[PDB]
Each structure stands twice: as C-alpha cells, then as structure tokens.
C-alpha cells in the first residue's frame, strides 16, 4: 500500500449569523 | 508502496457567525 | 502495481461566518 492521502482541504467559511434584534423605541415626542 | 491514497474530506463549515448589529434606533416619536 | 495508501485525514474546519444582517428599526417614539 502507498502512502496516507493528503489532508483534506480546509472547510469553508461559516454561514452568516442570525439577524440582529430590533432597534431601541425613538426619543418620545415633545409633550 | 503503491500511490498515495485519496486526499481526506474536506473540513466542516465554519461556525454560524455572531448576531448582527441592533436595528437603528425607531423615529422621533410625534409632537402632543 | 501497488494498491494506493490510505485515504488522508479530515481537513479543518473552516472560518467563522459573517456577523447577521443589521435588525430592523425599532418603533417610534411614543406620542407627546
């Protein structure tokens, strides 16, 4: 038998993380 | 003595990346 | 001819992902 193959290639970049949350409420109206 | 074997798999997918940013900050809220 | 050698070890994994999209606006400020 010959020698072990190579290593196999590096995997590939990971998927994009989950959304991010909704923003904060905006600055209460001028009463 | 042969060849040599077959190159291994390839390796797994990156890890899911971090949460993305907070939303922009919602309007200014209306005058009373 | 010799049989070929044994097939190689897994690659690594790969890199982290890309942070998530941005969130969507958050509400509007409450009425005055």
Redesign the interface.
């Given at each position: 038998y010959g020698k072990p193959g190579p290593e196999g290639p590096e995997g590939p970049k990971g998927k994009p993380g989950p959304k991010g949350k909704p923003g904060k409420p905006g600055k209460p109206g001028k009463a | 003595?042969?060849?040599?074997?077959?190159?291994?798999?390839?390796?797994?997918?990156?890890?899911?990346?971090?949460?993305?940013?907070?939303?922009?900050?919602?309007?200014?809220?209306?005058?009373?």
């Open positions: - | 003595y042969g060849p040599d074997g077959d190159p291994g798999d390839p390796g797994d997918p990156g890890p899911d990346g971090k949460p993305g940013p907070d939303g922009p900050d919602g309007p200014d809220g209306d005058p009373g």
